[PDB]
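>> Question from a student workshop board

For tomorrow's exercise we were told to take the sequence and the ligand below, predict the bound structure, and bring the output to class. My setup keeps failing. Could a helper post the expected result so I can at least see what it should look like? The ligand is nickel (II) ion.
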Amino acid sequence: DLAERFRTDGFVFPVNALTHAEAEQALAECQTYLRAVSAVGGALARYAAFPKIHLVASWADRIVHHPAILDAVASLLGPDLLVWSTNLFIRPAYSGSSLAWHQDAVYLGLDGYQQHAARVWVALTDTTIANGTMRYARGSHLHGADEAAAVDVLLDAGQCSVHHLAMAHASGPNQTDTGRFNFAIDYITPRVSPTAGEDSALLVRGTDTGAFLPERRPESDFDQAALNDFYSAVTRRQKRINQTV
Ligand code: NI
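>> Workshop helper replied:
Here is what the output should look like for this input. Compare the format with yours to find the bug.
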C-alpha cells in the first residue's frame, strides 16, 4: 500500500525514521561536521553538502543505514538496495531564495530510476509552511522527463519523505528565524544502470552491487582511508555528472 501511494502520486510521506531526539542529535552532529570541514578547507569543504557525505561522516553513515528507512525503501523497491548519493539541503533563516519547479538532474545519468530508485528526504528540523519547505507535484513523475496539485512536504523532525526521481518539486524561501535542514539519500537497486561512465555506490541490502563499484563505510569520522575513498568516489561521480550535462 505504501508502494501504491508511491506509484500513483510519485511520493509518499510522512515515513517515520528518526525520533525527535534522534533528529536533534543528528542535526547537532551535522552542524559539528560542517564546522569541521569548513575549518579543514579544500576538497571536503567544497563537497561538504554532496554527494558522498555518508562515506566520511558517522552521522550520515548512520542515517543511511537506519533500519526504518531501509525497510520502507525495500517496501518500495525490493530487498536489494544501494546508496547512490547523499545531499544536505539547508535553507538558512530568512533565506530569500526560491526554486522553480524542476526535476533533479540526477535522473538523466541513471537508466532504470523509473522503477528502481527513490530519494529519501529526511527532516532534521521540522518542515513548516513558512520555513522554506519542498513542494511536490502529484503525479508529475509519470512519463519521466502546474500549480494546482502542489503538496507541501510537512514533516516532524525525524520523519522523511520518499519521492520518485522524476518528481517535480519546488522550494520557497525560509521566512522564519530558524534554518531548515534536510538530508536526502538516493536509494537504487542493482537493476539501475549508469547511463554513461564508471560509477560507484554503497551496498546496504542484499549482496548484488550490479554495475556499481562497491564503496565502504567509514570506521571513523574522517578516517584517512575513508578520506581517500571519498576523494575517489566524489571525483568519479563528478566526472559522470559533468558528462551527462
Ligand atoms: Ni531539486
